[PDB]
Amino acid sequence: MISLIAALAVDRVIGMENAMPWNLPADLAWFKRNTLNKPVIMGRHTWESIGRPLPGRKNIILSSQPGTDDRVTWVKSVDEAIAACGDVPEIMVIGGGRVYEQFLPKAQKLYLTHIDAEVEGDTHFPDYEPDDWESVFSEFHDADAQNSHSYCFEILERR
Ligand SMILES: NC(=O)c1ccc[n+]([C@@H]2O[C@H](COP(=O)([O-])OP(=O)(O)OC[C@H]3O[C@@H](n4cnc5c(N)ncnc54)[C@H](OP(=O)(O)O)[C@@H]3O)[C@@H](O)[C@H]2O)c1
Ligand SMILES: Nc1nc(=O)c2nc(CNc3ccc(C(=O)N[C@@H](CCC(=O)O)C(=O)O)cc3)cnc2[nH]1
Ligand SMILES: [Mn+2]
Ligand SMILES: [Mn+2]
Ligand SMILES: [Mn+2]
């Protein structure tokens, strides 16, 4: 099973200038809980944005060019990325935009955080047909002293 996890601001913005400009600790905690002990697939730009291996997870990086760090696994195509995960119950795809586009048709589940923030960005989450997806979990949170925007965690499953 392939799942995508992402945090989206208004208008499906996911990034700007290879960064995420907001800071929502509660959402990073949700990201860690849902990815720990699973393989994570990311594109090269997202690898450079994170800047280090994510502990407790098999880190698989898509790039057309040879890898430059043996702490992670480098692959050259979608099919190779999936194969490098082995026989696990759930593969997590952690972006970015180009990678989400390629894995969306293959995904059975989306873990989405909707953030009530207006962000200029240059990267968007793919348009997804709403009729294909059933919302199985949602949880709304108001802003607090640690999280400066309201946010909604949602899990969707392909019908
Ligand atoms: N809000 C969120 O949830 C979230 C999550 C993740 C990322 N982001 C943001 O998203 C942005 C990065 O997204 P992005 O769309 O620019 O880049 P990306 O999807 O992270 O990476 C694209 C790169 O991945 C490689 N790639 C992708 N598909 C491939 C394939 N089929 N075969 C081989 N290599 C492949 C290529 O690397 P080469 O050029 O080396 O071939 C390509 O240039 C940043 O702003 C980041 O902060 C946000
Ligand atoms: N919901 C969601 N939020 C995100 O921030 C997110 N980020 C990415 C890609 N970028 C990043 C950037 C930083 C870390 C990070 O530092 N993670 C730590 C945080 C643990 C914690 O804060 O409790 C980790 O161990 O996962 C992960 C992914 C992909 N999907 C996402 N999905
Ligand atoms: Mn092939
Ligand atoms: Mn197998
Ligand atoms: Mn806001």
Side-chain angles (χ1 to χ4, degrees):
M1 177 170 64
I2 293 166
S3 296
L4 276 59
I5 183 160
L8 279 58
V10 163
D11 289 344
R12 310 194 324 271
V13 170
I14 64 170
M16 182 51 178
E17 292 172 318
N18 218 41
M20 301 179 308
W22 61 80
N23 178 33
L24 281 183
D27 177 55
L28 288 178
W30 159 267
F31 172 87
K32 187 178 178 174
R33 184 174 65 95
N34 286 301
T35 60
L36 199 65
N37 302 313
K38 304 180 190 172
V40 297
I41 295 170
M42 71 191 92
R44 181 191 48 95
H45 297 320
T46 295
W47 161 246
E48 291 175 357
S49 183
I50 295 169
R52 55 273 299 162
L54 292 170
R57 283 151 276 192
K58 185 173 186 171
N59 290 229
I60 295 162
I61 321 301
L62 278 157
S63 174
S64 66
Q65 300 310 320
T68 54
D69 190 325
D70 274 354
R71 298 179 297 168
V72 299
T73 296
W74 298 85
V75 297
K76 297 190 194 298
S77 65
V78 167
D79 286 328
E80 191 184 1
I82 294 169
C85 293
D87 284 341
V88 299
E90 188 174 24
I91 295 169
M92 302 300 295
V93 176
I94 73 166
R98 295 294 296 171
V99 169
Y100 290 136
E101 285 174 7
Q102 288 170 86
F103 281 90
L104 183 63
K106 305 182 152 286
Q108 279 275 294
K109 189 168 186 180
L110 306 175
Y111 299 76
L112 298 183
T113 303
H114 306 279
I115 303 171
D116 179 36
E118 280 272 26
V119 169
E120 283 255 30
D122 55 23
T123 308
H124 294 78
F125 193 77
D127 209 6
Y128 55 107
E129 167 57 63
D131 295 355
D132 289 353
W133 297 92
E134 176 179 8
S135 180
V136 299
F137 174 86
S138 63
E139 187 184 271
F140 176 71
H141 296 266
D142 282 302
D144 62 25
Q146 290 177 55
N147 297 277
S148 62
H149 303 279
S150 56
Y151 50 101
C152 187
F153 295 134
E154 186 176 28
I155 299 173
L156 300 103
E157 292 176 351
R158 191 181 284 274
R159 293 185 180 283

